[PDB]
A paper describes a structure:
Prokaryotic sodium channels, in contrast, are true tetrameric structures, composed of four identical subunits, each one equivalent to a single eukaryotic region. Both eukaryotic and prokaryotic Navs consist of voltage sensor (VS) and pore domains, which are responsible for regulation and ion-translocation functions, respectively, and C-terminal domains (CTDs), which appear in both cases to have regulatory functions, albeit of quite different natures and structures. Prokaryotic orthologues exhibit approximately 25–30% sequence identity with human Navs and several have been shown to have sodium ion translocation activity and one ([name] from [name]) has been shown to be blocked by human sodium channel blockers with similar affinities and kinetics as the human Nav1.1 isoform3, thus indicating the structure/function similarities of eukaryotic and prokaryotic Nav orthologues.
In this study, the high-resolution crystal structure of a complete voltage-gated sodium channel (with crystals formed under zero potential conditions consistent with an open-channel state) has been determined. The structure displays an activated VS domain conformation, three sodium ions present in its open selectivity filter, and an open intracellular pore gate formed from the S6 transmembrane helices leading into a regulatory CTD. It has revealed the nature of an interaction domain that forms the basis for understanding the opening and closing of the intracellular gate, and indicated a set of residues essential for enabling the open conformation, including signature residues that are conserved across prokaryotic and eukaryotic sodium channels. The present structure is the only complete crystal structure of any sodium channel determined to date. It is also the only sodium channel with an activated VS and a pore gate sufficiently wide to enable the passage of sodium ions, both features expected for an ‘open' state channel, and as such it is likely to form the basis for new molecular dynamics simulations of ion translocation.
Numbering used by the authors:
A (entry chain A), B (entry chain A), C (entry chain A), D (entry chain A): -1 to 91, 100 to 261
Write the structure that this text describes.
């Protein structure tokens, strides 16, 4: 139908994207103003009405998208499902309404590409992240058994130990705050904590560098296909294509 | 005119650059000495006169540049405008006179190239920086609503929350100073702060690596054009040129 | 023998790997539950029996591997020796039974490849690590002689100095906690500590980047050979092979 | 002369290098033992005699090198001058005798190559380091004028300000220790400190990454020439050589 295409072309336009972006910003701005404890009843009611207005615009927007694309369809995209869930959950009387400012990511294509680059880079680091998980679990069980009875606030149970070890890994007051006090009772505690810091800071660095490097490469390809409809072929492929061309030249040289 | 060219050749010489560099250093040295509270009236007046002398040399320098290049002209360069604004603002009776030591960057070509490499690398990271901005805004609104009434010094309002979250992201006393005290009242506060630290430290790393990698590549090209008048062609272009040469050889092989 | 091959094919199957993985997780879960101080005698005895059950499954597993591969043989692999030592040490009545969760690394091939990539990357950074060792030793001897008599808790002996310098390198309370107090007695102490921080943070960064970059390249090759039986040839080799092909074409062009 | 060559071949042997390495380690070990306050007079005198023995072996070693190479000659190498200065200064009755453990670097060729890679990488980062220097100087003058009268311990003079800003850049107690107290008197102090932290942490990262990347590339070339007498040609050169070969093939195709 001509109406489905007329709506699609409007939905897909820069102006419609700019209007929706401006309304997301307006909603974020009113929710930020609503954190103000000193506001009058009238000022609060006014801002709450602007929140309702912003929300209804989003319901019309999603309903226009479910029409112009179909329900099969619109829900085929992960970003449409996210946008749907975020607005639909608000119509169910979850306190943190500000999470709908995340819609800026889904609505802005360049921001959307950064996030999908980061998400697509996550499977490729799962073994490093599992190794980190294993090191933390082992260390938490050790720390609980070793220091729990003497330092219960920091190592009293598994939960307390996982928290303190996360603090230790971030190098936050690890020595003046945690290990120098522990060594007053357990003089060889550094044999546990120094190798733990060495292992975890290294692994967390590796984990983040791995994501950082992969995500940049993925986004760079997605940004190329968004502009030219294709991406740059790997240097190995270009070198392989040159080698195949040299085969035809070597063959033509004989005949 | 011959006079315009005689001045241009002087302005563009190494000696003129060295004299102006020495006067910037002299001005920086006298302003550093003027921070000394224990100085006598005579010593203070002497140094203040050396500041006036340094400033007048800069007015002559800029006036010589506006003459030898034209006003169209001299103002065509962003570094000339910056140099002009920095000296012209001093003739308007803005307390921080030391900001004129930044002129070392504009006056030294290698330092100028490092800074322009850093500035040209900024547009290419805007989506990562916006993502970081969005995460901070969302988190600040959440933190204000969650902990503002119980921890007003740290989360009392949006401003206080943005400051504390910046401190948390830098890992400064995040646990012993902020989160362990918050958990005494809100036992599940780690569900908010640990993912916030994970997200923001990762994003800030990505943002800085992105600038760091792009800026180095840009400066390396600018440093090449400064010396040889051109830069090294990308490996993809060299491989494409080889492929085009193989087309002419394959064509010549048949005929 | 047909029985040796029937067992090998079972040992090498995905199902056997999944069962052993599930039993490692079960053992880790029961040992984590045994850190709980508030557990009843019956609950403790039950979990201790589940630890015995998990351990006996591992003895059967290793015994099946020593049979199907031979003792020459099974012990030819470093991962089999590690798995053997970990289970065999438990049969010698070393308190830290949780270290057997490290078996997840040896049992999961992708996790095994990450760790062997990290280990193979270590010889190539030995000179940077030795340089770091030398800087720490020199600095520890200096710090002991300089500040030991006035600050005995932090620099009293070599051991105390090595610990404080490790804390200083990690930037943990280095100034408010260590150097500002030392400067109250030794005003030029910053001449020692600031260059030490500059040197060691740089070296530790270099050491970790070196491992991080090498380990990723090694694992990427091992992951390729695991799937395709071979890895991608270096760009230098592909370029050398193209050059050798151009020699045959230049030779054929004359004759 | 045959004697000069017989000594050179001994000096250059692995055994002579191992003996000298063992004596450097022995000297380091005795100097580390001499930090012990509780040592008896006899134990101290014994270790002091072992220090004299180690030192005399080094005088014979350097004298053998000045003979076998010549004084022109031996002093032609920067590592020989360093080794000479380190042993010659000990014969002038400078308290820190432990600095002679640095000789391990000059005596071990792989360690020597890491350090020369780091030194050769320093000129190429001078403009980034100068930019950092400029930012620190400007900020120190500002901080002294702004906060010196109200916070004299931290910003009382230029020296105190340079120290506090170095602490701020390392993110050590920057907020709980320095900026939250400063904001109690100067509520907008974050306008100064947050951009300062943003600028300096970024610049120091860039400076260290620059050295780290360049130093690795230089050492890798030096390690290649040490083993094969030459290094791997850049990918740009190999691609340029292939292009030159394609010129001769295109020329031969016509004639
Ligand atoms: C690698 C990521 C490691 C994540 C570590 C998170 C540990 C969770 C901390 C925790 O559970 N508690 C805080 C203990 O201080 C106790 C609370 O459950 C109570 O309610
Ligand atoms: C990602 C960058 C985040 C920047 C965060 C800056 C927050 C600004 C802090 C702030 O405004 N105040 C300090 C609150 O402690 C209050 C003052 O405005 C009063 O005068
Ligand atoms: C580069 C890695 C540097 C590792 C540094 C480890 C130092 C070891 C600390 C130490 O030995 N003690 C703690 C001193 O506080 C003393 C104890 O030995 C007592 O029992
Ligand atoms: C980028 C590197 C920045 C280096 C900063 C070093 C500052 C030097 C500190 C200093 O001079 N003093 C300590 C002030 O606390 C004062 C002493 O000179 C007195 O004797
Ligand atoms: Na840190
Ligand atoms: Na810290
Ligand atoms: Na700290």
């Amino acid at each position: 139908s001509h109406m489905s295409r007329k709506i699609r072309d409007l939905i897909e336009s820069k102006r419609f994207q700019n209007v929706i972006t401006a309304i997301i910003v307006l909603n974020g701005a009113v929710l930020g103003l609503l954190t103000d404890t000193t506001l009058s009843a009238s000022s609060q009611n006014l801002l709450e009405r602007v929140d309702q207005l912003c929300l209804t615009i989003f319901i019309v927007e999603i309903s226009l998208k479910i029409y112009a694309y179909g329900v099969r369809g619109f829900f085929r995209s992960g970003w449409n499902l996210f946008d749907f869930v975020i607005v639909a959950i608000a119509l169910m009387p979850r306190t943190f309404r500000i999470f709908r400012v995340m819609r800026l990511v889904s609505v802005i294509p360049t921001m959307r590409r950064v996030v999908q680059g980061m998400l697509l880079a996550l499977p490729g680091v799962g073994s490093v992240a599992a190794l980190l998980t294993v090191v933390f679990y082992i260390a938490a069980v050790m720390a609980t058994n070793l220091y729990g009875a003497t330092f219960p606030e920091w190592f009293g149970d598994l939960s307390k130990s996982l928290y303190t070890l996360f603090q230790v890994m971030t190098l936050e007051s690890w020595s003046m705050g945690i290990v120098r006090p522990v060594m007053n009772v357990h003089p060889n505690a550094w044999v546990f904590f120094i190798p733990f810091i060495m292992l975890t800071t290294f692994t967390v660095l590796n984990l983040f560098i791995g994501i950082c490097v992969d995500a940049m490469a993925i986004t760079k390809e997605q940004e190329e296909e968004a502009k030219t409809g294709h991406h740059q072929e790997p240097i190995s492929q270009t070198l392989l294509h040159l080698g195949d061309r040299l085969d035809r030249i070597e063959k033509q040289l004989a005949q």
